[PDB]
Structures are given as C-alpha cells and as structure tokens.
Copies of this chain bind each other. A is one copy, B any other.
C-alpha cells in the first residue's frame, strides 16, 4: 500500500521516467525492461524498525513497504543503452528511442 510518485517525459531521442524514492537504498530497488514494459520495483525500509526501544515513534507521516510500478513504453527502445541514475531520492531511467521521429508543434491561441 505504498505507491512512489512517477513522472514520464518524452523527447526527440529520449523517454525519461522519474520515480520518487526518498530514504531508499540503491541496492533495494530494481529496474527491469521487458518488451516495452518498464518495471521499477523494490522495498523502502523503516530504519527505525531496527528498534522498538530507547524512546519511540511520535509521528508517522511516512509509508514503508514493497512497491512495484510498471510503465508501458509505446516507442521502440534500444535496451542496451538504457540507463538508470539514482540521485537525491530521485530515480531517473533514460530510454533511448530507436527511431528519433516526428517532433512537436506549438499551437498559437486565437
């Protein structure tokens, strides 16, 4: 019952996925890519579960537990160049597009 927040963006050559994982060890999270499915899974651990002793928990605003979340990628990816980078509790997965393809247009409003 813990869902990490996720953003998804798409550029010319790139599809990037942001996952919010504060207090999560790099070792604890797994990134997988299968046939257009990108799965980010893992577990966020309570580092106070190490004890019930020596004074206790006054306030719980934090969610802890196992999480798995799947993004479908409609575009075709080169899976060998896929990169994952974990910084400041933010996990960013970069998926290179096999085909750099037709880009945006800004629409002016009358």
Q: Measuring CB to CB, which residues of chain A are less than 8 angstroms from any residue of chain B?
A: 1, 3, 5-12, 14, 16, 18, 20-26, 29-37, 39-43, 46, 48-49, 51-66, 68, 70-72, 74, 76, 79-80, 82-86, 88-91, 93, 101-110
Q: Which residues of B contact A68 (CB under 8 A)?
A: 52, 55, 57, 60
Interchain CB contact under 8 A, A82 and B107: yes
10 tightest A-B CB contacts, nearest first: A89-B89, A32-B55, A11-B55, A22-B89, A35-B36, A23-B90, A39-B55, A8-B59, A57-B68, A20-B22
* Residue in contact with A21 in the complex, picked from B6, B88, B103, B106, CB distance below 8 Å: B88
Interchain CB contact under 8 A, B104 and A59: no
